[PDB]
Amino acid sequence: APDAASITSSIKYHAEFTPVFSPERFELPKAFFATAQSVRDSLLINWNATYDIYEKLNMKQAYYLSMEFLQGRALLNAIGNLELTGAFAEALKNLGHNLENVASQEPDAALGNGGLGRLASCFLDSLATLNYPAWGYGLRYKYGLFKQRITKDGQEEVAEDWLEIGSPWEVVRNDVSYPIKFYGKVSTGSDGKRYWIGGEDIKAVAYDVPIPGYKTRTTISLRLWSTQVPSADFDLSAFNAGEHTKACEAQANAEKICYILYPGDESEEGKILRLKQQYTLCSASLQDIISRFERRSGDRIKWEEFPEKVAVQMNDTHPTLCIPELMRILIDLKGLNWNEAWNITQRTVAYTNHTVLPEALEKWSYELMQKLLPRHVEIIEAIDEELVHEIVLKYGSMDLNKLEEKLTTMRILENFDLPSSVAEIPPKKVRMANLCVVGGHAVNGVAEIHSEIVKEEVFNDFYELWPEKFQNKTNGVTPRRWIRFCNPPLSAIITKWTGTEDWVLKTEKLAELQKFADNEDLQNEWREAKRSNKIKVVSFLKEKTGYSVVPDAMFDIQVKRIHEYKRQLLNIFGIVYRYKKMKEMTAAERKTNFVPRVCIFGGKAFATYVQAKRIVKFITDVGATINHDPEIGDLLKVVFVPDYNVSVAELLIPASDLSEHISTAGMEASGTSNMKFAMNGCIQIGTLDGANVEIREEVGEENFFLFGAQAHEIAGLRKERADGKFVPDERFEEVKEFVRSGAFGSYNYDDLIGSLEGNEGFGRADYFLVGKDFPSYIECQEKVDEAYRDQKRWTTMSILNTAGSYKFSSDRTIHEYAKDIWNIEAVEIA
Amino acid sequence: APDAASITSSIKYHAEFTPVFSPERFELPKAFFATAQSVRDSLLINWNATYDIYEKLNMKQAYYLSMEFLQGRALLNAIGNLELTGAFAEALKNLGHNLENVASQEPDAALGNGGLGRLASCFLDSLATLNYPAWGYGLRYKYGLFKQRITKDGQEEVAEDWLEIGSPWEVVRNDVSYPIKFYGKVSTGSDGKRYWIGGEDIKAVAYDVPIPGYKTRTTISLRLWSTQVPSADFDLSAFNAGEHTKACEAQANAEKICYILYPGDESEEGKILRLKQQYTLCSASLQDIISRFERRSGDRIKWEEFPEKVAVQMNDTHPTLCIPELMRILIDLKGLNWNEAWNITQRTVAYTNHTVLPEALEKWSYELMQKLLPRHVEIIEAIDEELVHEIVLKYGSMDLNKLEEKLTTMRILENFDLPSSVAEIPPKKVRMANLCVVGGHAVNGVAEIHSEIVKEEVFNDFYELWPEKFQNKTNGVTPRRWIRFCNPPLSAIITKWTGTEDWVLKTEKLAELQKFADNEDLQNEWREAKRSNKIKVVSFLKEKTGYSVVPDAMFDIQVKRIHEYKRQLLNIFGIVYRYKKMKEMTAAERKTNFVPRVCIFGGKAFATYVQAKRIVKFITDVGATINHDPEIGDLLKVVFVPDYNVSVAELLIPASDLSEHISTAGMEASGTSNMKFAMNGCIQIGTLDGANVEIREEVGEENFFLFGAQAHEIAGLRKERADGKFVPDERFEEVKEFVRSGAFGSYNYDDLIGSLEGNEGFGRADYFLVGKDFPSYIECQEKVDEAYRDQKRWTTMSILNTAGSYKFSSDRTIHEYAKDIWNIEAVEIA
């Protein structure tokens, strides 16, 4: 049991004896690594304790595969779970530091981007907190996706620096390498089996990132792969001949696999890279898993037993190749018969779909996949025939016209001849999501509504063939990180008023506050914790944005990907209006009409999404004009927080008042940010889509600002536009002409306002009904104004947001996955 | 004071808590790193203890700059010096290992190639053993020079793998980075000073390799530089556009600097790289040094004081740019006046020449150096004018014809106009060695004879201008590594018969054996230690060469660079003859005539040295034919040890009988291998050149086989050849026709034997007098045969080799440098 003094010794020890700096003084950078490595000593004891048990017991284990994990800062949560936040903060005071300044140093480990990541991350938290044997597998990205710079011109992008000095967490296993292969050819041995040789050979090496659980010893892995070449593959002959580039070809191709997340794929090159990324993650991971099986088996190796021991969850369509791969392994190497193998595959692999719209499901070039994975392309032609012959066995061929509709929808091979058929240059493609349904024993959406959309729209024919497959597992975000750690003054309120700490685990007890939401003592405590959390943000803002804001205003946050469809353009238009009105006022009138506000925008645009970037540009120009208008004072501020990520969120969220999720209704599959915002008492404003539904519900209709069109209407409202039947509001045109006046800088936004106007055109005619939803929105904002003025009401609305969250704990979501897909029971670690 | 038990704890601790492997079992690879890091804990305590004192005292410090250090295996010597060889070997037994199998793992750290390196290495040993404040500065080579593979075809080359897993010794200082610059332009500020901007900017980062001293706490650094780029220099825009190569340009150029040692320089590219390598080492090192000065100074910074605190020794012509650089710094940044600066430069910088033949001294392209270092090229034109105007002040211009001879020899700028002159397309070059004499306060050769060659041939005119400069510092090799550690059964004999251990330090006591060389007890002990050491080699050989040899034969070693001029061709010809004669014999006769022998060859050829490679090829073919001739048995074996290096040597040397150094007399500047061989009782056979002289002398004429022409004769003997006045021996033609018969494989060596024949031609007519020296050599080998048959004699000859070595301790060589060039006194570390 470590004490503050023992820890101080550990920090010192590392600071000197395993250093990455000069030995002079104890500056922050050094202080972090020393502190971090001190933690990691503990993390390892448990990682080993855990490894041993999982190994000796030989029970089932789950393997969560994801192209992205968005782990963020590991430090505070690592020490939190260990229950040492106090010994560490005292030992750091002894060494002339404070914990928050030490945590400041750590970069966000950039191995992911979006919810897809953050989910996968949250999940690992749970999986370990609850003692469930499961690892995460991912790529180890050098340069993340990118870092965002907000400048006079808008967004600029620069490669991430997180591994500049290296990561103090990761533990490199050099005896864990697996061979990967691309290109080359296949041929049949005189034993029978097929043999895939030639092309390129590279290596994949394991780096384990420990994950510890809250109040438990259970410590699992996020094993990230790193691609490279053996040194011998350096061409000396050429390097010395002068051709330096030519000599590095080998390792440069082999390494670029792990450079950036989601590489540009416009060119053939980008595509091949993407594909490599995928196949690597798959083959590497599976290989490692199989090896662990074999090892744990000993003499009694029963391939029968595989799916009873292992479960592989493809987080979206990326890890798809797990299927043709696991088959290839079990056929060409393990030497089992096609069926036996296919059985084991189906019974191990599971799909988790994330997309709403058939077209967001990934489709590959045949000739490409052919040329890169030519053994896999054969296994995929065999799984397409197994399907074509079971669609012939069901339904039959009385209809012919319906057997052709069934085959067209469900066949994995697009634009092909059928095998043996009856009926008396479009480019060949491979549908991945199709292959995912066919191979896996389970398919799951991520929200009630979505999981139904998959059954009754996305995968209909499939649903009817195997309805037993389809499931739902509504998203959740971990409360450790998103409450207990990121928001301590709330966490104290919560512990006091529920009477124990146990709520960090037993998150249901969140609801026990329902009965106090009226209380004036809890109200004051609540409003005090929320200021407290905002005070920290005023500083961060000053710093990163260059703007001073008051803490006595509403914090109005829209942090999520900058896309037309998320409709930041809407939020800002909402601001632009509230401003314009302010200007046509008096001082007396202004204070009366509007409440003091700080409208926080955040998130990353594409690179070549001309418009997305023109928006961030707009937002900044708006803010500029406003924040430095002398008449506005502190009644309104508009900033744009640069380089939004886990940490940024860990600071904005605990200090939000209102959080927008105003995406064109029905397009959003779930959402995670809200689930957080909710937990921290933030009041949400949104259209009725994704989670917005399930949150609104769980928290109460009178605790969530709704507005705009709904799912059903959209087809019709787009028809109205399409026929020249839309009449805009006159306040919308008021904003539009105001921008064309030049009231926000000399930057011309005529091409921005262009995409809003017309009836037709790929980038015209306001496809996302910003014009349509505008009135209902700005009206809804008046209602927020109204609501905030009643502070007693507002505070209650907040308290209830928190009380109604407890079902969005990832703990729940996982329990569901663990019990209803993977079939894994807990493992106690004594 | 660590005990075996404390060490075991340390090894365990690291094996688990700072690992580079999976946690399963304690296999050798893991066992090494754990053991090594355990050592490095100790190394650091001292490195810090030492750092503090050198820092607080602020005395003078020396800085040995070298393009190559050949450090070899650090482990055994590190523990040796610490006096823990025994605690470590016991703790490794506790963990189910033995020390020698643990040491087996460690790769030779490949940061160097030849003596030039090994010297620099030996020196650091001393410098620290004797408590002299001095560091080494070098480049940190990723792939060394190369690894040698000996195959059916001969030598192949593959990039070194030493950093494959990373080095457990090196300590990376991330807060130690200095900016380097190439290309770009210069311009004059309106303050006066010159400003060099533009081109390329890169970074150089310090990695400290500790060196501990024998029986002392004094632990200094071999600070190696690593070149790189800040992450921000990764082109996201391009990478995502598809152009992956284009995006990495920045770091690929910046990194390739530290890839391989001596890159091929035939092409313009190779040259620029070479130059970069140099300038980096220089600027980086100096910057670091200056910084340490400034820091140690505080308020009282006196630039006057610089040379009184600092000394920089350019190990050969490589680190030359230290001069124009230190000037540039002291002028453009420190802002001092030209003279004051030039004074400080001369008084700090010192040259150590290594070459005999004016043409082996490095000369650069002007337009190249111009375009790469254009600020330095100006400083070099100013130092050339300072010289031209002092050659005008001395001598005068009564002669004119002699002032032109003086200027032509001594001017740093080759092929230029003079400034202001009297006298009423050859490519512009920069002579580096010339610049080295001009800037430095000291110039030194490496042997008596050589140091005279520099005064009276190489640098004559210069000698007469400033004869006060010229020195000698004869080479030495450290006895810790090359006796006490690499040869323990001798080391026991030595400790016993001298009566204390103190000889490891006080190496003079080696001579105390002179009086026992007759003794029969010491003789037996000596012959027993030498077998013992050979037994180990029989095994290594079997292993790496694939040949089983007896231990009861003479071990005849020629290990050094494979060059025509080192004349391996001679040794082997010597074998070929002794063989041929064997064949024309009977069994009775053979045993009578020849002694049992194992002729060991080793070392690396160039890549594009067609002949050097054809030789290793020959040697292997010869060996093949012989070793598997049934008539020869164990009377003769010829092997070729692949990938000769420090470790190979640490094994061959303690077990040599005879060691050849048979290079065409007078061409060799010193030699270090012999100095070792000597120390270990090996009897040398050689021509009278370099060290051969000083060794022969110190050990006794009747203890060293001499042969062949001498220095003076060579011009005349080449004249005899040139005029068609050479008559070959008839045994030489006997060998030559025997090879043309095809007695050694089907491989045709007609082009090999070609280079021996004729009168003229760049690659013809036996320029290296192999034909001429052949008779005298093979005659000399009969004398070795004779000598070995008398075992009592032979053993005595051996004992005396050892007794007469003690002046070749690097301890001596350094003391000399320390006292007579650098002016540095000892620093005790309590």
From Swiss-Prot, chains A, B:
It catalyses: [(1->4)-alpha-D-glucosyl](n) + phosphate = [(1->4)-alpha-D-glucosyl](n-1) + alpha-D-glucose 1-phosphate. The keyword Chloroplast applies. It is an enzyme of class 2 (transferase). Its EC number is 2.4.1.1. It comes from the Eukaryota. It is found in: Plastid, Chloroplast; Plastid, Amyloplast. Keywords: Allosteric enzyme, Amyloplast, Carbohydrate metabolism, Chloroplast, Glycosyltransferase, Plastid, Pyridoxal phosphate, Transferase, Transit peptide. Tuber. SUPFAM superfamilies: UDP-Glycosyltransferase/glycogen phosphorylase. Its cofactor is pyridoxal 5'-phosphate. Phosphorylase is an important allosteric enzyme in carbohydrate metabolism. Enzymes from different sources differ in their regulatory mechanisms and in their natural substrates. However, all known phosphorylases share catalytic and structural properties. Belongs to the glycogen phosphorylase family. This is Alpha-1,4 glucan phosphorylase L-1 isozyme, chloroplastic/amyloplastic. It comes from Solanum tuberosum (Potato).
